[PDB]
Design a protein around this ligand. Sequence first.
Ligand SMILES: CCn1c(=O)[nH]c(=O)c2c1nc(Cc1cn3c(n1)CCCC3)n2Cc1cccc(C(=O)NC[C@H](N)C(=O)OC)c1
Ligand SMILES: [Fe+3]
Length: 290
Amino acid sequence: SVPWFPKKISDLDHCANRVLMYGSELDADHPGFKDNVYRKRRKYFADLAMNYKHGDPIPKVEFTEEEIKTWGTVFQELNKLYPTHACREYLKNLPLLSKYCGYREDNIPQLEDVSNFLKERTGFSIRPVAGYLSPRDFLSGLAFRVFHCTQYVRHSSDPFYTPEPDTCHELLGHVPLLAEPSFAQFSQEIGLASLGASEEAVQKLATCYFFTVEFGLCKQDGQLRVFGAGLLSSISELKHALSGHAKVKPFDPKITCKQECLITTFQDVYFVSESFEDAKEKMREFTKTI
Ligand SMILES: CCn1c(=O)[nH]c(=O)c2c1nc(Cc1cn3c(n1)CCCC3)n2Cc1cccc(C(=O)NC[C@H](N)C(=O)OC)c1
Ligand SMILES: [Fe+3]
């Protein structure tokens, strides 16, 4: 029996509010685990996502100057690295987001503006998410070109805190590539493949997603470049990825899906896609077997 899956974009209303672990219930090792002010702020962001329904404009948020500063610091340092690290598709769309969506050191972009930009570019849109979803539900969003996005900012105490996604990771890591048609097609086809798929096939697709969309490397004009959003929002690992101290394998779904996804350290291995079009072709061949 096929499990329930969303049939239209508004059906994600019934997936999105199935959060297994809420964004306000912080990890024990979270930098703001003892910060009562930060906890209330996270509960505010999580209620915004919980009350969101498809069709709504995404609520616009007044970030605090503390939150702006944290973004600014991350923004400054990553932008020094992008020209020598990021893939050409990333570098092409970043300036368009500074122009149209307010990407500045002194301004955190709003998800609604970014979502309206993505809709025009690739038909991708944003949905604020109140915490961790099952891989089935999270990936099911991509089937309708919906990216479930966190809206909160990481704790100001530790601005290089990379384990959980925050809105800095979404905006600097994911969005510039969701504005690229070839990548948007690749992402959506992961989403389509998981709709009603077995729990086994969902987990394999999630693992391929992790080592492409989140931590992928690609070869361009003979060079290794970064396109994974988790690398593009992590100063330390972005540098580590294109250094000679990291192990690298070609992207191959049948081998890639066996790799453990690490959470609290650098990845043990990164997979290199030849291009987004080729990765998409490899996933097409792979999904037919699962
Ligand atoms: C396909 C796998 N996947 C999934 O099955 N479900 C998701 O909901 C999900 C996801 N993949 C991303 C997107 C993502 C995740 N990461 C990065 N981008 C950048 C590198 C760090 C991890 N999400 C959305 C999401 C939203 C909110 C929280 C978490 C979360 O991982 N919380 C930390 C930890 N899980 C936790 O709850 O406490 C131990 C993830
Ligand atoms: Fe991510």
